[PDB]
């Protein structure tokens, strides 16, 4: 008998919610869909025993977090009041990000790319450092897919000597800062 | 160190003067005779270099000693009189060619300034040591000339074999300190010239 | 003759009054530190024999320059060294210093000429010394310092709208990127405001990602403000503040402000303290935030002692303690969060404070103090359940460590000193890009010098460089004249020995 918001106040919808017993008492449980408002309206009263409500494993693909886990309340010679959990969604964007380290002057000719591991001859991102040591790549989508950073500069062999890093982020994280360090010589 | 700068200049040029004064310079008013004796050595020094641009460290010494050694042998042939004194205009000639050339140039640049690196002292030992080396060098030239006995012959060709010594020295040291291999190349050139001493000696007659 | 460069003593003025050293022209012998006159002559130390009463005695003699040869790593020096040099610097830097004061980086060609001008200075024995007289002479280039009339101080600056409402409160968080040492291109500055700037700009990806999302979007407009123009002052702050208040009558620093967070040296260490210039009162949005904060650092994270510090405004100083002293003069709620206790600690400044300084597990744990106590506050939670036995920022929502190193490494990669991060740097590019790429409305202001009265003017010829030409007395010189004076007298003899000896034969 409380309510299931979001982190900003907004009532969650159907989220699936029951209360797990401990002890002797953990073959008893019920589950219930919250509505719009969030209101939800477990049952199965019985006293005697403390109540766990927390985030079914199943049914619940699209949140991802419930920061208050469990929530004990103890089951007095009364109902239970007032159990607010607050829920985050599952954030699916990759936000990649990531500094270069070099000299002002080659900054400007220097494009960092997005080289696909399967062909690394067809580039899907090229964005520009231009005149910031920070490129911000597009967001991805987080599903293995092996990637590479090779910094691809305009820079040729016929005036400088120059060594291109390559890093691999293979995506199953949330985020990445690759570092591609860029001193030519000569 | 401007005052530095004197002092080298009073190592190296005023030797040059003693000798003037005290060779009987009146005899010919060398003068002109020294001018075109160093006329003779620049041609030869632009011949050297234009060889060396053409063409391996002992064909450029042997062709600069070549060129050398027909310049004093021009020179000395260019008058007549006294063997020393041809000796003289010679060799004082192509001493004050040299110390005209790159030992006072790089004198005046360098020093007078803030720096002291001894290696303008060293230039100037050098300088008066080449005085000596050019005495020998002409004293070659005069065992060349003055009719050709007591195997004179072979002495000269030993002589000439012995010339180029600085370039050899100094190629002996750079396979081997600065003032250790000056000090080497004062050794060897004093030692050049007590066998050309022994030489006059011998061909006085 | 070496040629080292030497990165010179702070020349800046703040508001009218002079600071540090005001000369960059010497030309001197190098006679390093003994009994002789010592005036007039450049006087060379290194920093592991430098003793503040020998320093005093160096400047109180009218030397004609000082140079200190710090060690090149910088790192492998003694830690009780550094402390010691952590004690120097503010009671050094506060003088108007007339005598050029420089400091190089240790090379072999120093180590020897310092060795030997260590030889030749403490010390037949007159002539002996006359003739090895090894005492080099040390010039510089360029002309003296020129007052730079036309220095804009920079400021990054960044918005995050609220929910919905025109009348949202707007927290603000600001921090100072620049930090000056004794010299401003050996001022790297990682302890310093340089690892605040770090936490807010993780601060701004953080919320950024918050706020992107509806059902996580909360009601509160969050004003970034990288400022530049920090140490010396606090300019950048007070420009900003002067615009947003009294020039315009837009913008979100009057319409319902919220309490001014300002973040300096909040990297290493194991306290954290919020500093108060006036105690918040009871109720209102600064000891909300007071109160989530205290039940953070007591039941998430215990390793951290937490306590106010209550430090009266006092108007006698030349620069106004912290950052939250120029928002608390214009009647605006504000507060500073540091690992310091005292202001008057010198772990500020610090030319010492190299990157290998700011741990990042303390770094780390400090942002996700601040970061929590800020969700906390921000989102409502405390009167919603949500025990502080637990965080928010668990997972996908991390504080990247990886960023927050980088981050670190790149502002340490170069010096930060306000003197030196031009109006168009790529340091300032760079955090222009990152403050874009997470927040709205970026935008950098200026301050000039006012032209009037100058606020502040920076002084340039910071990184001159000197050459060590070796030279002789001309006492040595005149040895060498008697010397070839005795060789010509042999030559003349000469002649005439060579002479007598053909005609012996
Ligand atoms: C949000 O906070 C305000 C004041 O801090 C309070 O009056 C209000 O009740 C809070 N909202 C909820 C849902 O607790």
Redesign the pocket.
């Known amino acids: 008998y409380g309510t299931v918001s979001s982190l900003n106040?907004e009532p969650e919808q159907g989220v699936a919610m029951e209360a797990v017993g401990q002890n002797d008492c953990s073959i008893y449980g019920e589950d219930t869909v919250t509505d719009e408002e969030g209101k939800f309206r477990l049952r199965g009263l019985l006293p005697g025993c403390v109540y766990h409500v927390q985030l079914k494993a199943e049914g619940n693909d699209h949140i991802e977090r419930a920061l208050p886990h469990h929530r004990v309340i103890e089951v007095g010679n009364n109902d239970i009041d007032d159990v607010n959990i607050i829920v985050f969604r599952q954030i699916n964007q990759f936000d990649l990000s990531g500094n270069v380290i070099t000299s002002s002057e080659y900054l400007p000719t220097l494009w960092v790319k997005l080289y696909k591991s399967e062909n690394l001859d067809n580039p899907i991102q090229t964005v520009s450092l231009g005149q910031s040591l920070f490129f911000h790549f597009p967001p991805l989508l987080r599903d293995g897919e092996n990637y590479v950073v090779l910094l691809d500069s305009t820079l040729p062999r016929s005036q400088y000597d120059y060594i291109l890093p390559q890093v691999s982020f293979t995506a199953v994280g949330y985020h990445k800062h690759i570092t591609l360090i860029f001193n030519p010589t000569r | 160190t401007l005052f530095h700068f004197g002092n080298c200049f009073a190592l190296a040029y005023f030797p040059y003067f003693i000798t003037y004064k005290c060779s009987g310079l009146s005899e010919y008013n060398a003068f002109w005779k020294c001018v075109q004796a160093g006329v003779t050595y620049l041609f030869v020094q632009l011949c050297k270099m234009l060889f060396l641009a053409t063409f391996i460290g002992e064909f450029m010494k042997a062709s600069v000693d070549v060129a050398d050694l027909i310049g004093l042998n021009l020179v000395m042939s260019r008058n007549a009189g006294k063997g020393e004194y041809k000796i003289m205009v010679a060799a004082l000639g192509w001493a004050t060619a040299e110390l005209i050339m790159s030992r006072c140039i790089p004198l005046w640049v360098g020093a007078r300034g803030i720096e002291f690196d001894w290696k303008y002292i060293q230039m100037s030992i050098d300088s008066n040591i080449s005085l000596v080396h050019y005495i020998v060098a002409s004293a070659q030239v005069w065992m060349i000339t003055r009719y050709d006995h007591t195997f004179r012959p072979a002495v000269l060709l030993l002589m000439f074999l012995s010339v180029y010594k600085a370039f050899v020295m100094e190629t002996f040291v750079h396979l081997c300190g600065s003032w250790a291999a000056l000090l080497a190349r004062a050794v060897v050139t004093g030692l050049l010239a007590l066998s050309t001493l022994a030489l006059y000696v011998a061909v006085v007659n | 003759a070496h040629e080292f460069t030497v990165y010179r003593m702070q020349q800046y003025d703040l508001q009218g009054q002079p600071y540090g050293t005001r000369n960059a022209v010497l030309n001197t012998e190098a006679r390093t530190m003994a009994a002789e006159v010592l005036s007039r002559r450049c006087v060379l130390m290194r920093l592991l024999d430098f003793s503040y009463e020998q320093y005093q005695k160096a400047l109180r003699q009218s030397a004609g320059a000082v140079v200190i040869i710090l060690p090149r790593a910088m790192a492998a020096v003694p830690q009780d060294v550094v402390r010691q040099f952590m004690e120097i610097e503010p009671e050094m830097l506060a003088m108007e210093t007339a005598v050029p004061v420089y400091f190089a980086v240790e090379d072999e060609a120093l180590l020897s000429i310092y060795k030997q001008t260590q030889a030749a200075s403490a010390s037949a024995e007159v002539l002996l010394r006359t003739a090895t007289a090894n005492g080099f002479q040390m010039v510089t280039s360029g002309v003296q310092s020129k007052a730079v009339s036309d220095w804009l101080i920079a400021s990054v600056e960044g918005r995050l709208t609220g929910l919905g409402g025109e009348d949202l409160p707007t927290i603000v968080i600001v921090a100072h990127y620049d930090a000056f040492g004794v010299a401003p291109w050996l001022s790297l500055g990682a302890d310093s405001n340089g690892s605040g700037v770090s936490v807010l700009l993780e601060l701004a990806r953080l919320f950024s990602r918050l706020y992107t999302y509806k059902r996580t979007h909360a009601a509160y407009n969050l004003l970034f403000f990288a400022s530049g123009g920090g140490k010396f002052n606090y300019q950048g702050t007070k420009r900003w503040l002067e615009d947003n208040l009294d020039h315009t009558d837009s913008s979100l620093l009057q319409d319902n402000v919220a309490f001014v967070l300002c973040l300096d040296t909040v990297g290493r260490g194991s306290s954290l303290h919020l500093h108060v210039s006036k105690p918040p009162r009871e109720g209102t949005l600064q000891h909300?935030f007071l109160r989530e904060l205290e039940t953070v650092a007591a039941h998430q994270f215990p390793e951290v002692r937490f306590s106010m510090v209550h430090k009266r405004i006092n108007l006698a100083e030349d620069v106004l303690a912290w950052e939250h002293e120029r928002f608390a003069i214009r009647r605006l709620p504000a507060f500073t969060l540091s690992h310091l206790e005292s202001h008057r600690d010198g772990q500020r400044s610090s030319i010492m404070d190299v990157r290998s300084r700011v741990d990042s597990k303390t770094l780390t744990r400090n942002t996700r103090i601040i970061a929590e106590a800020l969700t906390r506050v921000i989102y409502?939670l405390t009167?919603?359940g949500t025990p502080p036995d637990m965080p928010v920022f668990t997972e996908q929502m991390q504080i990247q460590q990886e960023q927050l190193d980088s981050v670190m490494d790149w502002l340490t990669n170069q010096p930060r000193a306000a003197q030196l991060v031009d109006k168009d740097s790529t340091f300032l590019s760079t955090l222009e890009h990152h403050l874009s790429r997470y927040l709205k409305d970026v935008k950098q202001h200026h301050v000039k010098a006012d032209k009037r009265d100058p606020e502040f003017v920076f002084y340039d010829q910071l990184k001159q460089v000197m050459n060590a030409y070796r030279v002789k007395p001309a006492v040595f010189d005149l040895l060498l004249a008697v010397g070839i004076a005795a060789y010509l007298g042999m030559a003349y003899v000469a002649v005439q020995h060579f002479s007598l000896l053909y005609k012996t034969v």
């Open positions: 106040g | 909300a409502n009167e919603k």
